[PDB]
Design a protein around this motif. Structure first.
Motif, PDB file in Angstrom:
ATOM      1  N   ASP A  46      24.418  54.010  14.815  1.00  0.00           N
ATOM      2  CA  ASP A  46      24.707  53.366  16.121  1.00  0.00           C
ATOM      3  C   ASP A  46      26.165  53.320  16.453  1.00  0.00           C
ATOM      4  N   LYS A 252      23.297  45.063  21.250  1.00  0.00           N
ATOM      5  CA  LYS A 252      22.093  45.729  21.762  1.00  0.00           C
ATOM      6  C   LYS A 252      21.752  45.275  23.163  1.00  0.00           C
ATOM      7  N   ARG A 259      21.553  51.005  29.694  1.00  0.00           N
ATOM      8  CA  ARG A 259      20.279  51.709  29.830  1.00  0.00           C
ATOM      9  C   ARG A 259      19.570  51.421  31.155  1.00  0.00           C
ATOM     10  N   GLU A 264      23.359  56.116  31.225  1.00  0.00           N
ATOM     11  CA  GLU A 264      23.214  57.195  30.259  1.00  0.00           C
ATOM     12  C   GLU A 264      22.826  58.516  30.912  1.00  0.00           C
ATOM     13  N   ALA A 271      28.344  58.433  28.395  1.00  0.00           N
ATOM     14  CA  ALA A 271      28.157  57.374  27.401  1.00  0.00           C
ATOM     15  C   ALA A 271      28.381  57.924  25.996  1.00  0.00           C
ATOM     16  N   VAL A 272      29.349  57.359  25.272  1.00  0.00           N
ATOM     17  CA  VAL A 272      29.711  57.854  23.939  1.00  0.00           C
ATOM     18  C   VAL A 272      29.933  56.691  22.970  1.00  0.00           C
ATOM     19  N   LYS A 273      29.762  56.945  21.676  1.00  0.00           N
ATOM     20  CA  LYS A 273      29.958  55.921  20.648  1.00  0.00           C
ATOM     21  C   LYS A 273      31.401  55.939  20.172  1.00  0.00           C
ATOM     22  N   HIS A 274      31.900  57.109  19.816  1.00  0.00           N
ATOM     23  CA  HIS A 274      33.271  57.212  19.315  1.00  0.00           C
ATOM     24  C   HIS A 274      33.901  58.556  19.634  1.00  0.00           C
TER      25      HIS A 274
ATOM     26  N   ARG D 257      17.030  60.769  17.249  1.00  0.00           N
ATOM     27  CA  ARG D 257      17.982  61.750  17.771  1.00  0.00           C
ATOM     28  C   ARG D 257      17.279  63.031  18.231  1.00  0.00           C
ATOM     29  N   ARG D 260      15.974  62.308  21.610  1.00  0.00           N
ATOM     30  CA  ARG D 260      17.097  62.243  22.538  1.00  0.00           C
ATOM     31  C   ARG D 260      17.553  63.646  22.948  1.00  0.00           C
TER      32      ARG D 260
HETATM   33  C1  LIG Z   1      26.196  61.587  26.011  1.00  0.00           C
HETATM   34  C2  LIG Z   1      27.145  62.580  25.411  1.00  0.00           C
HETATM   35  O1  LIG Z   1      28.019  63.009  26.126  1.00  0.00           O
HETATM   36  N1  LIG Z   1      27.073  63.022  24.150  1.00  0.00           N
HETATM   37  C3  LIG Z   1      26.090  62.752  23.099  1.00  0.00           C
HETATM   38  C4  LIG Z   1      26.511  61.625  22.161  1.00  0.00           C
HETATM   39  C5  LIG Z   1      27.956  61.734  21.656  1.00  0.00           C
HETATM   40  O2  LIG Z   1      28.090  62.964  20.924  1.00  0.00           O
HETATM   41  C6  LIG Z   1      28.367  60.600  20.707  1.00  0.00           C
HETATM   42  O3  LIG Z   1      28.093  59.322  21.286  1.00  0.00           O
HETATM   43  C7  LIG Z   1      29.846  60.670  20.348  1.00  0.00           C
HETATM   44  O4  LIG Z   1      30.269  59.449  19.728  1.00  0.00           O
HETATM   45  O5  LIG Z   1      25.654  61.686  21.010  1.00  0.00           O
HETATM   46  C8  LIG Z   1      24.224  61.653  21.174  1.00  0.00           C
HETATM   47  O6  LIG Z   1      23.772  60.341  21.538  1.00  0.00           O
HETATM   48  P1  LIG Z   1      24.287  59.053  20.726  1.00  0.00           P
HETATM   49  O7  LIG Z   1      24.438  59.321  19.247  1.00  0.00           O
HETATM   50  O8  LIG Z   1      25.486  58.563  21.493  1.00  0.00           O
HETATM   51  O9  LIG Z   1      23.120  57.964  20.865  1.00  0.00           O
HETATM   52  C9  LIG Z   1      22.889  57.407  22.146  1.00  0.00           C
HETATM   53  C10 LIG Z   1      21.853  56.315  22.019  1.00  0.00           C
HETATM   54  O10 LIG Z   1      22.192  55.426  20.962  1.00  0.00           O
HETATM   55  C11 LIG Z   1      21.761  54.111  21.336  1.00  0.00           C
HETATM   56  N2  LIG Z   1      22.738  53.124  20.853  1.00  0.00           N
HETATM   57  C12 LIG Z   1      24.061  53.261  21.112  1.00  0.00           C
HETATM   58  C13 LIG Z   1      24.986  52.331  20.623  1.00  0.00           C
HETATM   59  C14 LIG Z   1      24.512  51.257  19.860  1.00  0.00           C
HETATM   60  N3  LIG Z   1      25.364  50.331  19.374  1.00  0.00           N
HETATM   61  N4  LIG Z   1      23.187  51.125  19.601  1.00  0.00           N
HETATM   62  C15 LIG Z   1      22.296  52.029  20.078  1.00  0.00           C
HETATM   63  O11 LIG Z   1      21.080  51.876  19.824  1.00  0.00           O
HETATM   64  C16 LIG Z   1      21.591  54.061  22.848  1.00  0.00           C
HETATM   65  O12 LIG Z   1      20.301  53.549  23.222  1.00  0.00           O
HETATM   66  C17 LIG Z   1      21.769  55.497  23.291  1.00  0.00           C
HETATM   67  O13 LIG Z   1      20.690  55.957  24.094  1.00  0.00           O
HETATM   68  C18 LIG Z   1      23.592  62.082  19.863  1.00  0.00           C
HETATM   69  O14 LIG Z   1      24.302  62.542  18.950  1.00  0.00           O
HETATM   70  O15 LIG Z   1      22.360  61.946  19.719  1.00  0.00           O
HETATM   71  C19 LIG Z   1      23.763  62.617  22.260  1.00  0.00           C
HETATM   72  C20 LIG Z   1      24.627  62.495  23.500  1.00  0.00           C
HETATM   73  O16 LIG Z   1      24.153  63.434  24.471  1.00  0.00           O
END
Ligand SMILES: CC(=O)N[C@H]1[C@H]([C@H](O)[C@H](O)CO)O[C@](OP(=O)(O)OC[C@H]2O[C@@H](n3ccc(N)nc3=O)[C@H](O)[C@@H]2O)(C(=O)O)C[C@@H]1O
Ligand SMILES: CC(=O)N[C@H]1[C@H]([C@H](O)[C@H](O)CO)O[C@](OP(=O)(O)OC[C@H]2O[C@@H](n3ccc(N)nc3=O)[C@H](O)[C@@H]2O)(C(=O)O)C[C@@H]1O
Ligand SMILES: CC(=O)N[C@H]1[C@H]([C@H](O)[C@H](O)CO)O[C@](OP(=O)(O)OC[C@H]2O[C@@H](n3ccc(N)nc3=O)[C@H](O)[C@@H]2O)(C(=O)O)C[C@@H]1O
Ligand SMILES: CC(=O)N[C@H]1[C@H]([C@H](O)[C@H](O)CO)O[C@](OP(=O)(O)OC[C@H]2O[C@@H](n3ccc(N)nc3=O)[C@H](O)[C@@H]2O)(C(=O)O)C[C@@H]1O
Ligand SMILES: O=c1ccn([C@@H]2O[C@H](COP(=O)(O)OP(=O)(O)O)[C@@H](O)[C@H]2O)c(=O)[nH]1
Ligand SMILES: O=c1ccn([C@@H]2O[C@H](COP(=O)(O)OP(=O)(O)O)[C@@H](O)[C@H]2O)c(=O)[nH]1
Ligand SMILES: O=c1ccn([C@@H]2O[C@H](COP(=O)(O)OP(=O)(O)O)[C@@H](O)[C@H]2O)c(=O)[nH]1
Ligand SMILES: O=c1ccn([C@@H]2O[C@H](COP(=O)(O)OP(=O)(O)O)[C@@H](O)[C@H]2O)c(=O)[nH]1
Lengths: 382, 384, 382, 384
Positions: A46, A252, A259, A264, A271-274, D257, D260
């Protein structure tokens, strides 16, 4: 005899400010041995599996610990501190460090400080004297009290530590190590980094970086503010990188906000994590503005004069240049949408409040100065 | 009237002596307070005297009992014990739903309690906050202060220390130590039959020693050596001696081994005990010839009776003490300790009241009622 | 490619039967890599700091874990299993073992088996098919079900495993490894070992070894039996080595029994926590009789024909030679005192039920036979 | 009459579907039973659908809630989760003082519960004991059997397996699965408006797919690959598909994933959901065109409605199944899975009753009352 240094990293939020020190220590094998411990958020999908950042910097990770209890609430935050505390002592007896480097104000750092202090292992606490107006103040200052040596980033932080009755002999005013990377920032093809993370048709200074974290004390208000913030961003309708939240409690529920707004799956949003730190610096350096309540907004981006909108109670009391517009009572969409019109696409002067770019070499000297004959903290009460 | 829900967690007799008076106070006013008691830590451990029984004998309904101590009696185990409380407490706290939690003192256990309350937005009343004892405990005490929202200190100098450490003076109450509520109300019953119970039939008032020495976690090998010499002195001085087992966990079994190998457990002159009930203990120390070791009782409580005290080592350096306390910091030979015994045994000093006036509890009850339930967030008064 | 073997030891009760295997594995560096993990009772002063036995055998201890929760009751026993389970997985990811050796029937072994099984690490379970009539039966047989490979000590134990639907292909009948040491036992100056542990004036076959453990299911009865047992030993009045109890739940109440009878300060008694295994073999081999409920009484001492008094419900259903006198309802002093008169100073024939003395070499072969392509347990139900 | 104190711990919807009927039974007879409910594990986790709410909506008073899951969604975390329950449960069990504890199934969580009860001398009723599913779960299930004092199995073949594994036949009850109490009493309401809620407005009975596939912990990279191919088939077959998120923890985020990156979450043909309420779920699977994946529901429950099933992979190999189930063990190409869909989608098989007769609960209640409270110790029938 080499100084055995253990650095524990739990989250990208410390890793951006510890990696420079780790690099410094590793470049001087004659004076230092380094053991790296990875725990906390780093091991969690996450949060973006950010242990990979540590692997990609070529550090040998000695130990990995699962220390996070699942639940994404306050109870889980506390259980996570407890999990690190049951797991760390045996690792620390094995590694036998002379000193441990601890950064910041998060629950995880309190576990590290606690375990070191109670086992008579010296502590170098980074980013000690600052003010951010949440529960984090409490944590930061409790860590200060456990810690034997202090490295602060500003003069005002130094005075706070001295006012809090710390020994001035054990304080070093170095600057934030993040500035070692900011003021040495290789602007490579920054456009191809903008294109990677925001989309093909985005131009410099024409995008927003949105990074907002929940405040654990008032989750229901954090939810409402974030809804309004997104609504504003949708209306303002310029390309927006939305980073997922990076405080665990409430996380969450904040993700659910995104969401249900369709963020998204929206042409205007990513939307990105890091984002890797080196790439992230380029993003914020060329942003139209930054919005939310990251410490980056109030501490780092001033270096590039990037406009900032700081929302809510998190970061109240931090030192900020002219580039930061505070909106405490972000209680309507209109207020936030206004702040966006005001700030988007402006250019401020380049400030250097939190660093001069030579934090690491000062820190390395401070580590070599430590003579290994006591330890016991002295508290200057008078 | 919405009653104030108060949770008091007790982990060791060392807090229970100072929390029990408050628990009694709170329980005597059902109209203003609901009380939930949580027992954890040392209280559930036979080595420590099963001191949960002291809580049962005071007639408190114990809501919850938690095994929170990891075995090992060393520094690693102390840390794992804090962690064990932290994984176990949050679900108990969500169930009990307290408005405020009372935390006492400077031990590892209190840091777990403060941490868990602070991170869950539960208000904290920290007892015995502003003091100085010159060990790792200073660090812990002052870290708890920073987490805690409300502070109850026992002296004016403790109050100033909290204010110097940038705490909000509005959230500090100078009450006195609650132990003094019991000390200054101590209706000396048949104190002789309490002396006879615990020291032996033929012992006279002011003709015995109470020995209570704890290991310092920072330097266990020195704690060992000091304790050996202390016992050797007590054997030579050869007057009836109540030896309390140590009550700091890290190093404890090595200190117990010292006693075992000196034959203290099976000696006519010595009585080895884990815990004396607080009310009986007050009578013992009040009539002792002298007290020796490094207890906080020596430097904080016994002054009230003018009992001579020998404080050994680094623990308690910096505490406020009356004329009754003789410090021997470098207790590095038997002769030095034996001398201190000759000097002090059987003397009588004036009765001091540094740590209390005997009305701490009622002041505390008022302070609890004053708390209005609309924020919370700690304020840090940083004067540059 | 060498087989990476992790052996975890938690108590002298497993270490007596695992040390021989560890020695075997270490003597063949060409086929095996060995990592040793020490946890549980080994790190506890009350149990005799028995990690020292491991240090004195010259094994490099990779990892030490504090895994025991204090309390010496049933709740604490369970929390101890849980503590090992939170701490072990990260150690096992680091050590990356191909197989893990688990011995016996104690709560600690269930933690080890559980953690290995759920992480897809192969398990060799030692001492699997036996019967002892306490909660330990349950534990032993639950471990059997988790474990992928089985090493039993008797033919009847082998048949029990097969009756419990284990795959006969994954069972090896080796003998108990303790017999490798018993049937190779160097009788050195055994008299100077008798003199060390019992006193200067004690003659061979004129002393008692008393080793009684609490049964967790009925502590109040364990207390009462132990009182009567000591009373008998006091009356019988021949020199007696009393080992402290070595089942955790109820242990302090049993120790209190000894304390209040004055056993610790009595000319006739010697109270000890642990006698080194090699010295202990000499003690029991030359004892007048042994009394209590140790597995040693019913499994090991038969090798020397030492008379045994087995008291209570622990060990009901174990296979025993002519040397063992059972007294189940040891409900008066007279019954126990009688059993002492009957048995003290007798000599039985030397039995070999639990081993032939070549367990280790058979085990080493069984380890090399394991081909590393599956794993999944097969359950022969028909 | 001294009432029987029964504690039921629930950790996941996977046990709650089969325990809720028993909890209802016990609660309807207050004269013979006291009930305490403990909620832990997956129930408290947003990713799993906050399924503690299903317990709240059934009106059970939850005594205790425990965060027992370590985050990581891998094998290490699964093990640490078991450990977390084990450090937290014993103090709850000492407080609740149950005469017996009901444990269901084969998951890591149930092994924690069985372990803690067995080592504390609390009696255990193990539900769903004698079955075979060909994963690590066999190991866990049969280890729980060995700890457990009383056994409730769902089929004659499960009963024989328990007896073959040397369990005492006196302590086995052949009741049926409690899920069948609900399946065979399933008063089909407006089932169309339940189809419309969960699949979309324009969906017709027998014209949709329910897809529920779990990772196998032993081979995650194969679980990933299979799931990719399964989704590719479902995309090509292009009939409305309810995709339930995975519900085995280890490997779960890598499976999510997969969904997704295939765009399943934002596709007209798919609906991605965490949990459908059991009563609504029964109606969904009862009227499905077919079901696909490796749920136990596919092989144990849906036979009752004659719903076609595709069981993929190694999970469920060895389970007893009627003519409605098509196994594809080596689902190693899209074509094989797409074929299985053509074969099975829209067929109708006869209604089977292998896992139950619909009166499991009353038989269980009697078995509980029969238990006399004088021993306990398990007996192991070792015929040579
Ligand atoms: C959106 C985008 O441009 N790129 C992709 C991103 C991106 O590479 C990373 O975030 C980088 O850090 O990765 C993907 O997506 P990602 O790994 O972000 O996962 C997105 C889903 O994770 C859930 N989430 C997010 C944060 C959190 N604290 N808890 C969660 O449960 C959300 O519900 C969201 O739908 C991937 O690898 O699968 C796929 C994405 O398509
Ligand atoms: C000695 C005496 O005067 N009285 C008795 C005392 C006394 O009443 C209590 O301690 C009071 O708190 O109680 C008894 O004895 P007691 O409970 O002290 O136990 C004595 C043994 O405790 C061990 N110990 C102590 C502390 C510690 N941290 N670790 C330990 O291992 C030592 O090995 C020591 O031998 C009893 O209850 O059985 C029996 C004693 O006879
Ligand atoms: C008696 C004797 O012959 N030898 C000594 C023994 C001997 O060397 C070891 O036991 C060997 O394993 O060691 C000493 O004594 P020992 O280490 O046995 O400690 C004895 C005390 O420990 C307490 N105990 C015992 C077992 C247990 N599970 N819990 C406990 O609390 C008892 O209360 C008991 O009084 C020593 O090193 O200090 C000192 C003893 O004098
Ligand atoms: C999609 C749909 O049809 N309905 C909604 C569903 C649905 O009602 C429930 O799931 C039913 O149990 O609920 C919502 O969405 P939901 O709660 O499913 O959350 C969707 C996100 O969950 C993440 N996830 C899921 C499982 C898991 N093990 N790890 C995860 O990270 C995925 O990243 C995914 O994007 C909602 O409550 O917000 C919103 C959805 O729109
Ligand atoms: O995608 C990102 C977002 C942030 N950061 C850095 O991570 C640190 C912490 O920012 P965050 O918002 O995660 O936590 P905060 O500092 O606000 O507590 C800062 O140094 C940022 O520059 C990063 O490297 N990549
Ligand atoms: O047998 C005893 C010994 C001490 N105390 C009390 O225990 C408290 C703490 O003393 P200890 O030395 O155990 O801990 P310290 O305060 O030294 O940390 C003080 O109030 C003592 O008066 C007690 O009630 N009974
Ligand atoms: O002082 C001792 C007592 C026992 N043992 C050995 O330890 C093992 C276990 O005996 P114990 O009574 O501790 O446990 P049990 O086997 O009865 O469960 C046996 O192999 C004994 O030979 C030992 O080496 N030294
Ligand atoms: O949305 C759902 C999906 C499944 N189930 C039920 O959940 C239980 C377990 O199914 P799952 O596939 O989650 O676990 P398994 O039994 O496969 O281990 C079965 O009774 C299903 O009928 C449910 O109630 N709602």
């Amino acid at each position: 005899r080499k100084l055995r240094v253990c650095v524990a990293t739990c989250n990208r939020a410390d890793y951006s400010k510890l990696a420079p020190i780790m690099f410094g220590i590793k470049t001087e094998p004659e004076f230092f041995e380094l053991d790296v411990v990875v725990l906390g958020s780093h091991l969690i999908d996450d949060y973006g599996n950010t242990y990979r950042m540590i692997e990609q910097d070529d550090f040998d990770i000695n130990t990995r610990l699962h220390t996070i209890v699942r639940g994404e609430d306050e109870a889980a935050m506390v259980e996570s501190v407890g999990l690190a505390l049951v797991k760390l002592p045996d690792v620390l007896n094995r590694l036998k460090p002379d000193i441990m480097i601890v950064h910041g104000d998060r629950f995880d750092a309190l576990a590290l400080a606690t375990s070191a202090a109670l086992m008579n292992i010296r502590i170098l606490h980074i980013e000690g004297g600052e003010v951010s107006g949440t529960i984090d103040d409490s944590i930061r200052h409790a860590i200060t009290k456990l810690a034997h040596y202090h490295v602060c980033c500003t003069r005002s932080a130094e005075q706070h530590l001295i006012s809090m009755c710390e020994d001035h002999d054990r304080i070093l005013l170095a600057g934030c190590p993040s500035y070692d990377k900011l003021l040495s920032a290789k602007n490579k093809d920054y456009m191809s980094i903008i294109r990677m993370w925001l989309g093909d048709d985005v131009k410099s200074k024409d995008y927003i970086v949105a990074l907002q974290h929940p405040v654990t004390t008032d989750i229901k208000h954090s939810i409402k503010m974030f809804e309004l913030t997104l609504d504003a961003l949708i209306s303002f309708n310029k390309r927006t990188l939305v980073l997922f939240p990076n405080i665990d409690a409430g996380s969450k529920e904040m993700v659910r906000v995104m969401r249900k707004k369709g963020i998204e799956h929206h042409p205007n949003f990513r939307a990105v994590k890091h984002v890797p730190f080196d790439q992230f610096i380029q993003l914020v350096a060329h942003a139209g503005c930054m919005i939310g309540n990251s410490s980056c907004g109030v501490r780092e981006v001033g270096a590039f004069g990037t406009p900032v909108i700081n929302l809510g109670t998190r970061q109240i009391g931090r030192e900020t240049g002219e580039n930061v517009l505070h909106v405490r009572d972000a209680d309507t969409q209109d207020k936030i949408l206004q702040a966006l019109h005001l700030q988007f696409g402006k250019q401020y002067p380049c400030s250097k409040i939190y660093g001069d770019g030579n934090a690491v070499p000062r820190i390395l000297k401070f580590l070599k100065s430590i003579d290994l004959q006591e330890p016991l903290q002295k508290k200057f009460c008078f």
